[PDB]
Amino acid sequence: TSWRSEATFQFTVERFSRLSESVLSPPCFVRNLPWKIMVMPRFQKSVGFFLQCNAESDSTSWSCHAQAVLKIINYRDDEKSFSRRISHLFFHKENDWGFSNFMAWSEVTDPEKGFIDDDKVTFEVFVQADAPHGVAW
């Protein structure tokens, strides 16, 4: 159910080589909160990859600590997929966490590396979150 303490979800960004603004995935519910993958170009230059939690809510009383593995899938060889880990207390003022320079833009878009196909790149997040505070009192 949406109350699950962990989940793995993916989001495929299309027309990747042309990305010029931040893109957000639909929500994946964990601990009954909406988690989303956020991808943004940073300085072409590098791919920004962040995990976002409960950003839409106007609440300023919530908090949720979680650990996660952010990974860019290599479709040719999963062992070649690139991942980084995070641990963060998410709350209204710090509702997303990740890396502005997750991977070099030239590497992810290299047609011979295995991360891009038909100008599509798939991002994956495995999030393990603790019970949130200040939400479902």
């Binding site: 931040s22 943004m40 962040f50 995070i86 963060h88 710090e94 997303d96 966490w97 990740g98």
Partner: peptide, 4 residues
């Protein structure tokens, strides 16, 4: 890691 940091905020966007």
């Amino acid at each position: 890691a940091h905020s966007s």
